[PDB]
Amino acid sequence: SGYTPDEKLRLQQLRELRRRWLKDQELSPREPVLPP
Amino acid sequence: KRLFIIKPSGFYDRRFLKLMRFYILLTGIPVAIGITLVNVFIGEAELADIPEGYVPEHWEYFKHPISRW
Numbered sequence A: 001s002g003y004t005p006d007e008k009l010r011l012q013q014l015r016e017l018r019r020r021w022l023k024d025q026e027l028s029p030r031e032p033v034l035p036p
Numbered sequence B: 001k002r003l004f005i006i007k008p009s010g011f012y013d014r015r016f017l018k019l020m021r022f023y024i025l026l027t028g029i030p031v032a033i034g035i036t037l038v039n040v041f042i043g044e045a046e047l048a049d050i051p052e053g054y055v056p057e058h059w060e061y062f063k064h065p066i067s068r069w
């Protein structure tokens, strides 16, 4: 029952990568640089 | 927090719409102004009887100035 160690490890690695990707989607305070 | 929203490129559709509007208006605003000026200052002809012995020109059988022209 439950995850095998391989499945668990792959889930942790994918989770770390996905959380990094979601963090990178955040906008810095100047991102909408509107031209004049 | 404010997040980036992934969308397709909206630049090209907007550019096309602006170009089409520009050209249509560029030729159609003078046409509308000319139509209004003609209507205001050169009205429509008034129907009248043919005077005796007179042979009207063919364009004289219509009433709107643009149609007559």
Ligand SMILES: CCCCCCCCCCCCCCCCCC(=O)OC[C@H](COP(=O)([O-])OCC(O)COP(=O)([O-])OC[C@@H](COC(=O)CCCCCCCCCCCCCCCCC)OC(=O)CCCCCCCCCCCCCCCCC)OC(=O)CCCCCCCCCCCCCCCCC
Residues within 6 Å of the ligand: B020, B021, B024, B025, B027, B028, B029, B031, B032, B035, B036, B037, B039, B040, B043, B044, B064
């Ligand atoms: C945006 C682009 C994006 C892409 C989109 C795609 C675009 C594709 C376009 C393709 C090309 C198309 C070209 C087609 C050519 C057709 C032209 C044509 O035949 O014109 C016909 C027609 C003109 O007919 P006509 O044969 O020349 O006139 C015969 C008479 O001799 C005339 O009678 P008159 O002696 O009384 O003179 C009237 C005169 C003067 O009349 C007046 O001044 C009186 C008006 C009332 C004022 C009274 C009070 C206001 C003043 C009072 C205050 C000041 C006075 C006191 C001062 C102190 C103030 C207190 O005004 C006019 O001459 C008429 C206006 C001229 C319009 C011509 C249209 C040309 C368009 C071509 C360009 C196409 C592209 C569009 C771009 C155009 C620019 C935006 O033009 C009209 O459209 C008239 C329509 C308005 C009538 C009222 C509407 C009635 C509504 C009933 C339906 C209700 C249901 C709800 C729906 C309502 C929605 C509308």
